[PDB]
């Protein structure tokens, strides 16, 4: 029932695409487990990251891009819809100008496109989570 973590999969994203992840943190929120989702330009994990989504469970969320191997301007959110010791459903939707991030069905974070989502070739899900579901869906 569990998927390998780090989870790496080739992907093709555009407006209307949704990346759905179902998982659970591997530690209590007091221990600050992390969750990291990276939308890469290539299959190599050292490649540029169009959209980096990093949850520090119980503390904050950081979003950024890595371009020409360098981390850019970080965006921080204190919104924490994720609940201690619970399974979560995270979905990342590709809108024309931004990603819209839902947590358990509730709109929780946004990130304006810095590089077109069509540059994405690979998605990596990793850090302190167990994973049961990774789905790419599309609605025109």
């Amino acid at each position, epitope marked *: 029932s569990l998927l390998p973590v780090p989870y790496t999969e080739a992907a093709s994203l555009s407006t209307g695409s949704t990346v759905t992840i179902k998982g659970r943190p591997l530690a209590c929120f007091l221990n600050e487990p992390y969750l990291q989702v990276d939308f890469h*330009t290539e299959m190599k994990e050292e490649s*540029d990251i169009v959209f980096h989504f990093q949850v520090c469970f119980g503390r904050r969320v950081v979003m950024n891009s890595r*371009e*020409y191997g*360098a981390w850019k301007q970080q965006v921080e959110s204190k919104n924490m819809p994720f609940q201690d010791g619970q399974e979560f459903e995270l979905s990342i939707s590709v809108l024309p*100008d931004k990603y819209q991030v839902m947590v358990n069905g509730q709109s929780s974070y946004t990130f304006d*496109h*810095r*590089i*077109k989502p069509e540059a994405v070739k690979m998605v990596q899900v990793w850090r302190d989570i167990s994973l049961t579901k990774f789905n790419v869906s599309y609605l025109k």
Partner: antibody
Amino acid sequence: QLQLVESGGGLVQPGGSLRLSCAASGFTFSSYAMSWVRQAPGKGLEWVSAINSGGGSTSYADSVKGRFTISRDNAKNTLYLQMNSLKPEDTAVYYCATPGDRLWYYRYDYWGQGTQVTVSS
Amino acid sequence: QAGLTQPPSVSGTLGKAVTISCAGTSSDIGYGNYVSWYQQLPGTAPKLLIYKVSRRASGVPDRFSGSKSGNTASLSISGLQSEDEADYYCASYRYRNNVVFGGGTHLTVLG
């Protein structure tokens, strides 16, 4: 540290040829599109030519089409501009720049120091 | 063919704000979100300030802002500093012509 270094500039007679080089370092050159952008004395910027990451797709400004050839050597991390049948209107500082393609909204994030080209008798 | 048209010269006052216009066509500025703004000092390479009409480049403070309305783009600069006295160029993708540029604007910072 990311660096772009143009070379090959100099004085050329009208109708003559010149090959410019741009040496890339501090980044994975083969992953990015590249462009040449020039600036004539006392004038603004003008895009010259563009090439994709692999080198299979190229494009040229109407003013240089049929006279210039953009190419790249990904094993040597070098971008080239072969310039033939040169004219005084080609006199400019030539810059190599990146990415400049559609997926990056055509922006130029990084530039070289530029190389001077003078077409004169 | 009408090109990206900017005012050759604009003036703003130290600590205050200024706008720089760039008039284009429905093939370039009015075609998509492909507007970029560059700062330049003569003898050096241009430096990106804005991309995708309104996004700031690396280390560019929020006092630099970009927008567009129809076929015209604008660069707004608030809290004017001595460093801002320089040249500015707008750029846009143009249908079948890759990147087109404005003729440039020299900004004077008065006071």
